[PDB]
Amino acid sequence: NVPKRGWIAGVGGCPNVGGICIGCTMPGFPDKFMPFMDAPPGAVLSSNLIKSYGPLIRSLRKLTKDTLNDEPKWRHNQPVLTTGY
Amino acid sequence: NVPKRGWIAGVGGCPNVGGICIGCTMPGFPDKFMPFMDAPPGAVLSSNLIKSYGPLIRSLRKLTKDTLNDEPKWRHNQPVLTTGY
Amino acid sequence: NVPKRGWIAGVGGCPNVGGICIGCTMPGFPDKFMPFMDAPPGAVLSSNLIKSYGPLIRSLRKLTKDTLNDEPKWRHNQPVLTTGY
Ligand code: SF4
Ligand code: SF4
Ligand code: SF4
DSSP string, B25-61: TSTTTTTTT-STTS--TTHHHHHHHHTTSHHHHHHHH
- The CA distance from A40 to B50, in Å, is 22
| C23 close to ligand 3 (CB < 6 Angstrom) | yes
A44 to each of B3, C20, C72, how far by Cα in Å? 29, 50, 46
Q: Look up residue C6 and give its amino acid.
A: G
- The CA distance from C59 to C51, in Å, is 14
For chain C, list the contacting chains (3+ Cβ pairs, <8 Å). Answer: A, B
| Contact partners, residue C78, CB within 8 Å, separation at least 6 | A78
Q: For residue C53, give the nearest of A53, A59, A67 by CB distance.
A: A53
End-to-end CA distance of chain C: 51
Do the Cβ atoms of B77 and A42 come closer than 8 Å? no
DSSP A39: P
Mutate to test the pocket of ligand 1, among A8, A21, A26 (most ligand atoms within 8 A of CB): A21
- The CA distance from A27 to A7, in Å, is 21
- The CA distance from A45 to A51, in Å, is 12
Indicate which technique resolved this structure.
Answer: X-ray
Do the Cβ atoms of A10 and B13 come closer than 8 Å? no
| Contact partners, residue A5, CB within 8 Å, separation at least 6 | none
φ, ψ of residue A84 to 5 degrees: the values are: 85, 45
- The CA distance from B17 to B8, in Å, is 13
**Count of helices and strands (H, E) across chain A:** 3, 0
| Size of the B and C interface in Cβ pairs below 8 Å | 13
Grouping H, G, I as helix, E, B as strand and the rest as coil, residue A15 is: helix
The residue nearest atom 8 of ligand 1, judged by CA position, is A2
Mutate to test the pocket of ligand 2, among B22, B29, B36 (most ligand atoms within 8 A of CB): B22
φ, ψ of residue B48 to 5 degrees: the values are: -80, -5
Identify the CA nearest to B57 among candidates A42, A16, C53, A36.
A42
Identify the CA nearest to B58 among candidates B69, B70, B50, B67.
B50
Which spans in A1-85 are helix H?
A: 2-5, 41-47, 53-68
DSSP C82: -
Do the Cβ atoms of A67 and B28 come closer than 8 Å? yes
